[PDB]
Enzyme design. Structure first.
Site, PDB file in Angstrom:
ATOM      1  N   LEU A   1      -3.675   9.306  -1.681  1.00  0.00           N
ATOM      2  CA  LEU A   1      -3.360   9.985  -1.051  1.00  0.00           C
ATOM      3  C   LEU A   1      -3.874  10.219   0.113  1.00  0.00           C
ATOM      4  O   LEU A   1      -4.565  10.900   0.976  1.00  0.00           O
ATOM      5  CB  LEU A   1      -4.589  11.094  -2.250  1.00  0.00           C
ATOM      6  CG  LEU A   1      -4.221  10.546  -3.313  1.00  0.00           C
ATOM      7  CD1 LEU A   1      -5.404  11.992  -4.078  1.00  0.00           C
ATOM      8  CD2 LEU A   1      -2.898  11.196  -3.496  1.00  0.00           C
TER       9      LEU A   1
ATOM     10  N   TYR B   1      -5.235   1.636   9.262  1.00  0.00           N
ATOM     11  CA  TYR B   1      -4.562   1.931   9.397  1.00  0.00           C
ATOM     12  C   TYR B   1      -4.477   3.558   9.597  1.00  0.00           C
ATOM     13  O   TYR B   1      -5.399   3.983   9.746  1.00  0.00           O
ATOM     14  CB  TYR B   1      -2.815   1.879   8.412  1.00  0.00           C
ATOM     15  N   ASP B   2      -3.872   3.929  10.584  1.00  0.00           N
ATOM     16  CA  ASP B   2      -4.002   5.266  11.260  1.00  0.00           C
ATOM     17  C   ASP B   2      -2.273   6.306  11.695  1.00  0.00           C
ATOM     18  O   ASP B   2      -1.900   4.658  12.501  1.00  0.00           O
ATOM     19  CB  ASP B   2      -4.922   5.713  12.374  1.00  0.00           C
ATOM     20  CG  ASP B   2      -6.039   5.415  12.511  1.00  0.00           C
ATOM     21  OD1 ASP B   2      -6.194   3.806  12.487  1.00  0.00           O
ATOM     22  OD2 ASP B   2      -7.495   6.115  12.203  1.00  0.00           O
ATOM     23  N   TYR B   3      -2.396   6.824  11.359  1.00  0.00           N
ATOM     24  CA  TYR B   3      -1.162   7.658  11.016  1.00  0.00           C
ATOM     25  C   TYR B   3      -0.894   9.431  11.356  1.00  0.00           C
ATOM     26  O   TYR B   3      -2.137   9.776  11.218  1.00  0.00           O
ATOM     27  CB  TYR B   3      -0.053   6.901   9.606  1.00  0.00           C
ATOM     28  CG  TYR B   3      -0.085   6.424   8.983  1.00  0.00           C
ATOM     29  CD1 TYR B   3       0.762   4.841   9.818  1.00  0.00           C
ATOM     30  CD2 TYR B   3      -1.083   5.887   8.191  1.00  0.00           C
ATOM     31  CE1 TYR B   3       0.792   4.086   8.906  1.00  0.00           C
ATOM     32  CE2 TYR B   3      -0.629   4.967   6.999  1.00  0.00           C
ATOM     33  CZ  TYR B   3       0.216   3.347   8.146  1.00  0.00           C
ATOM     34  OH  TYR B   3       0.592   1.961   8.007  1.00  0.00           O
TER      35      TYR B   3
ATOM     36  N   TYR C   1       0.408  -1.163  -0.665  1.00  0.00           N
ATOM     37  CA  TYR C   1      -0.178   0.129   0.027  1.00  0.00           C
ATOM     38  C   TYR C   1       0.776   1.320  -0.309  1.00  0.00           C
ATOM     39  O   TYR C   1       1.578   1.413   1.328  1.00  0.00           O
ATOM     40  CB  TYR C   1      -1.086  -0.329   0.960  1.00  0.00           C
ATOM     41  CG  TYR C   1      -1.660  -1.334   1.210  1.00  0.00           C
ATOM     42  CD1 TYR C   1      -1.897  -2.091   1.985  1.00  0.00           C
ATOM     43  CD2 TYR C   1      -2.577  -1.905   0.351  1.00  0.00           C
ATOM     44  CE1 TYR C   1      -2.837  -3.412   2.020  1.00  0.00           C
ATOM     45  CE2 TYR C   1      -3.526  -2.779   0.164  1.00  0.00           C
ATOM     46  CZ  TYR C   1      -3.235  -3.950   1.219  1.00  0.00           C
ATOM     47  OH  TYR C   1      -4.267  -4.573   0.991  1.00  0.00           O
ATOM     48  N   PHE C   2       1.067   1.951  -1.087  1.00  0.00           N
ATOM     49  CA  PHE C   2       1.676   3.324  -1.024  1.00  0.00           C
ATOM     50  C   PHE C   2       0.482   4.026  -0.183  1.00  0.00           C
ATOM     51  O   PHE C   2      -0.312   4.742  -1.311  1.00  0.00           O
ATOM     52  CB  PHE C   2       1.766   3.949  -2.786  1.00  0.00           C
ATOM     53  CG  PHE C   2       3.131   2.606  -2.809  1.00  0.00           C
ATOM     54  CD1 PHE C   2       2.662   1.318  -3.993  1.00  0.00           C
ATOM     55  CD2 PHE C   2       4.287   3.617  -3.623  1.00  0.00           C
ATOM     56  CE1 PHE C   2       3.705   0.456  -3.945  1.00  0.00           C
ATOM     57  CE2 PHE C   2       5.334   2.505  -4.033  1.00  0.00           C
ATOM     58  CZ  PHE C   2       5.526   0.992  -4.320  1.00  0.00           C
ATOM     59  N   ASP C   3       0.130   4.096   0.575  1.00  0.00           N
ATOM     60  CA  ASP C   3      -0.643   5.443   1.222  1.00  0.00           C
ATOM     61  C   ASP C   3      -0.739   6.203   0.399  1.00  0.00           C
ATOM     62  O   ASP C   3      -1.918   7.640   0.531  1.00  0.00           O
ATOM     63  CB  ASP C   3      -0.573   5.233   2.489  1.00  0.00           C
ATOM     64  CG  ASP C   3      -1.124   4.055   3.233  1.00  0.00           C
ATOM     65  OD1 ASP C   3      -0.184   3.554   4.158  1.00  0.00           O
ATOM     66  OD2 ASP C   3      -2.043   3.087   2.727  1.00  0.00           O
TER      67      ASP C   3
END
Ligand SMILES: [Cu+2]
Ligand SMILES: [Cu+2]
Ligand code: NA
Ligand code: NA
Lengths: 619, 619
Positions: A295, A374-376, A288-290
């Protein structure tokens, strides 16, 4: 005035209009990306020219376009049609997130697979997952998403607790067809719930935490002008926001006496990728290229006072474009605050009798995004002593699978029958350097051990060496933690009072880089992630380490292509690209929701100043 | 009962009385070290036996003694005369600090050297520096200090700005003789002052820093009982203090449901060494073992509220012995407080509609010490999620020299004529492990890259391997940052609910270890510092990685001697010794007083818990 100001709702409405008046934004066009372009080098001499760049998808199967618009003059600069087989598909659309599930719901192969496992289709969620590029020739030039299934027992249930392993679907989101359904056989769907707000799971909530109150009775020590210009404790910068990159810092400079001294022209996280290390064909395509594919800016959270950001907080609410070009505010999407950072400097001197203590602080600029499970959190810090730091905080819910009977070399067990495939989260920081201006160079610095003998009779001596990176062909570097390897960005034409070039030193964490085999698709597509440090010559069109269009793109663009030009970087306008990441072997403690883990880097002044820059901090 | 309680003034006075009564503490005797010993393994229904260990020096020239006293029983358990030429000299006495300057002030050779440089002896400070072991046979069995000179232009001047290079003297502090004065030639004494409170240098102090107020209106969330027993957010521990090691943590445990689960039995910084890398004869002998030679605890600062420790602070005021056995309190020597630590966990879920954020906190236990020019802060952290961390904060004034005309490979320039020799600050953390009790083992864990091919067709797979350290002979380990190497301490007899041994993982910073040639005196004396990780079998007399007597002591004791026993460590009572340090090439920004730099390590739970231990934290 402010040429680095955030996009306003008006400018976005006007891009929509200009695109309309000019014929490019029909009822069947959808904006996959929209953002303001930075000014050109030396553009401050002439008048403001706000340009926006736009990627346009077409729901009716027509070829997508890349368009530049001038909002200042109400004109279109260019519009080119894209061959996506060649230069890559456009970023995934938020409206496509639901489409994988909807299409599979009436597909007979999918329904057959669900019936074999006695799963109600109404309860089966399907993650909309980037496809990458593998062995499937039919996908070239087609817009594909892949689908992994998770059961939601009721509306408020965490579906991540119930992965449906042994099953994967491929879908075309334009033609609305299911290209493949692969069922390698049934695995038990893990039964325990992962509902971290269910009292049955949490037990009684703690009553032992007494409050901590952080206040500023006179307000914060930073000022915000022109919407996004920050001045704090000698620092000056502009806080930008882009739907791809998220928070971007511009014009980082430090007021040393009566001179505003540039340090970094532009700082951003230009890509982040999450490659999975499970060789099962159900997930072996998963990367995954977040930033590049999804975006991260667009999914930035609205942060809440006391919960997300604690203390005296000043918020920015960046505006972005929805799929039709209407402006949309991300309310309280960026937090800005200062906080105490312990002791800055301390000495109690026997001979002088002077005891001295000073306190440190840092300015924090942050946002938090959510991509699926996910959460970043992305945090930039500026310190009193001139240090600049970035930290990512990774949390959310881990991406799950079945745990195989008899175990796994590539998957951890989290709960009975529940696995978490091994993976990495790898970031690329793009630092368009401007150490005392744009004439910069980078040196690799290693510690040098010395042999006992003549000139070192006691065998105590040690030293260091610096190697200038002169051309891009020499500028792809790896970590060496054992020899204390760092990289110094200096200005060879700007000397401190001791006649030494001014510099900043980058200190990496030296975590593992991309682990995939060098012949893999992901090693080609995320080539930046295979090496710790890259240096290029600045070019306006070299924005991302993976290229402009990452989704379903083979190699052919990004850093390896840029480095191939072999340009002079010895006293020139240069850009440092630092890869840093977390290698995650999930632990039971990460389930059912994961405690924050962190990774990052910092840069510290290295002969930039003529002495400590914090002698004037008061008691 | 509390057998881990801090020593009281009354106990110290009682030790004095017992020694006096026993004929061991007449008027020529001085206490060089005194500390309470930990309770023996076992010991529960067995009543309290508080034992103290004492090193007694004799100012008349008689041999020193090592003595153990039972203060409970009023007895001398053991008293042994020491041959210091074999086993080492006692630690440096505070009263010896002034002796070097005093003796040199009337020495004809020293006076001639100063007159050659036109320096007034009344203005010349002499640092009392540990001597180590080199080529001077007459030093063997004598208490020696070495002296380096610094000019103080007036009482409140910082002498460190004015090093007198090319000159060193050696002194017998017992016989009060100057054994050698070495003058290799005059260097200019750097003239600029380094007075960081002088308005001429600081300039006008900042008025831009607005207040940050941190308060706890309901008080702190931890309790202190029995003087030094802390309970906080499921953690339990006792905070000890020793004059050598400083703050020592005992009985670190976590209450998981109904069970108090041990994690670490004892944690301390058991040694710290500061080796210099300048091959000049004036400094090539310089290696400061602040812990083993100087005793860092004894120089612990009194910490002022709002200055050194901010927020709602609970202080301990540990009591130590003076040179005569009288108790001396270090007022406010240890700070204890909890602080906010940003986001703990966060997820906003698209399918469930639940948004969830929780805040982290940490408990902080710290002290700050001063050893000549240097000041170090030692910080221990406990986090909500089970993580344990240590951080050292290094500050003070850098140790200076002349800067050679024509430069140096081993010294940095700081100001005109002023140098700072390269050096390291290397710590040893002794962690007497008790993961769910004492039956523990250590595994080295590396990431494992996999080759594309059969079973890994897409070349995405990656894994890890664990290697059990079975005997001490295989338990001397080095870092490998490239392969993400860590060390897991587990209990092979205690499994979590997934039938996996409970563990904690040690995460190192992977900084360079000792740089000196392996044939050097310092490589033998600080052998621990040459490798990142050691594991021993617990023994009550294996306290320090350098042995009991470091001052002027060659190799032959400490960790290399312990490891030779080759004892079983595979499911036994074990001790982890982690080496970690800063390598310091001083920068101009470090002068005239250095901003804090840091180094440390952490341990995180690794399948210790059955799921996240922070699900019961409230919003
Ligand atoms: Cu992860
Ligand atoms: Cu240092
Ligand atoms: Na640049
Ligand atoms: Na142990």
């Amino acid at each position: 005035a402010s040429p680095f100001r955030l996009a306003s709702a008006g400018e976005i409405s006007e891009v929509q209009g200009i695109l309309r008046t000019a014929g490019l934004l029909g009822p069947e066009k959808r904006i996959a990306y929209l953002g303001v372009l930075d000014p050109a080098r030396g553009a401050g001499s002439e008048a403001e020219d706000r340009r926006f760049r736009v990627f346009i998808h077409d729901v009716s199967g027509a070829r997508p376009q890349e368009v530049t618009v001038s909002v200042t003059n109400g004109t279109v600069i260019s519009a080119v049609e894209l061959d996506t087989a060649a230069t890559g598909e456009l970023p995934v659309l938020e409206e496509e997130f639901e489409v994988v599930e909807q299409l599979l719901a009436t597909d007979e192969r999918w329904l057959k697979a669900l019936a074999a496992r006695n799963l109600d289709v109404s309860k089966v969620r399907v993650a909309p997952l980037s496809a990458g590029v593998f062995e499937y020739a039919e996908e070239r030039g087609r817009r594909i998403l892949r689908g992994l299934a998770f059961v939601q027992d009721f509306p408020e249930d965490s579906a991540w607790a119930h992965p449906v392993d042994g099953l994967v679907a491929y879908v075309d989101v334009v033609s609305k067809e299911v290209t493949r359904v692969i069922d390698t056989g049934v695995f038990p769907v893990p039964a325990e719930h992962g509902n971290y707000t269910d009292p049955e799971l949490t037990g009684p909530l703690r009553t032992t935490q007494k409050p901590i109150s952080i206040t500023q009775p006179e307000g914060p020590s930073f000022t915000v002008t022109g919407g996004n210009h920050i001045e704090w404790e000698k620092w000056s910068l502009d806080v930008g926001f882009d739907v791809r990159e998220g928070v971007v810092l511009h014009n980082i400079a430090f007021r040393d006496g009566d001179r505003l001294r540039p340090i970094i022209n532009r700082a951003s996280i230009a890509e982040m990728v999450v490659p999975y290390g499970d060789p099962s064909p159900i997930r072996s395509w998963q990367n995954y290229f977040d930033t590049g594919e999804y975006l991260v800016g667009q999914y930035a959270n609205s942060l809440e006072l006391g919960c997300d950001c604690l203390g005296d907080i000043t918020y920015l609410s960046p505006v972005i474009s929805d799929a039709f070009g209407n402006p949309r505010e991300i309310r309280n999407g960026i937090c800005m605050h200062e906080e105490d950072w312990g002791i800055l400097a301390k000495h109690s001197d026997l001979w002088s009798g002077i005891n001295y203590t000073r306190r440190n602080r840092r300015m924090v600029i942050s946002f938090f995004t959510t991509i699926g499970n996910y959460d970043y959190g992305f945090y930039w810090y500026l310190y009193l002593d001139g240090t600049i730091e970035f930290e990512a905080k990774a949390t959310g819910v881990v991406f799950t699978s079945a745990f195989p009977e008899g175990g796994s070399d590539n998957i951890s067990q989290l709960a009975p029958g529940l696995g978490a495939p091994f993976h990495q989260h790898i970031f690329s920081a793009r630092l368009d350097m401007a150490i005392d201006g744009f004439t910069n160079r980078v040196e690799e610095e290693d510690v040098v051990r010395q042999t006992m003998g003549p000139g070192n009779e006691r065998g105590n001596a040690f030293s260091r060496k610096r190697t200038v990176l002169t051309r891009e062909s020499e500028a792809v570097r790896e970590a060496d933690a054992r020899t204390g390897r760092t990289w110094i960005i200096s200005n060879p034409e700007s000397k401190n009072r001791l006649n030494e070039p001014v510099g900043y030193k980058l200190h990496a964490h030296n975590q593992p880089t991309l682990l995939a085999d060098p012949g893999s698709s992901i090693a080609r597509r995320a080539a930046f992630a295979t090496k710790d440090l890259w240096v290029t010559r600045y070019a306006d069109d070299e924005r991302y380490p993976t290229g402009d269009f990452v989704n379903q793109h083979s190699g052919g663009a990004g850093l390896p292509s840029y480095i191939a030009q072999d340009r002079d970087i010895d006293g020139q306008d240069i850009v440092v690209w630092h890869t840093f990441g977390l290698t995650h072997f999930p632990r039971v403690e990460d389930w059912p929701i994961m405690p924050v883990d962190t990774v990052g880097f910092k840069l510290r002044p290295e002969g930039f100043f003529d002495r400590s820059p914090v002698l004037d901090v008061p008691a």
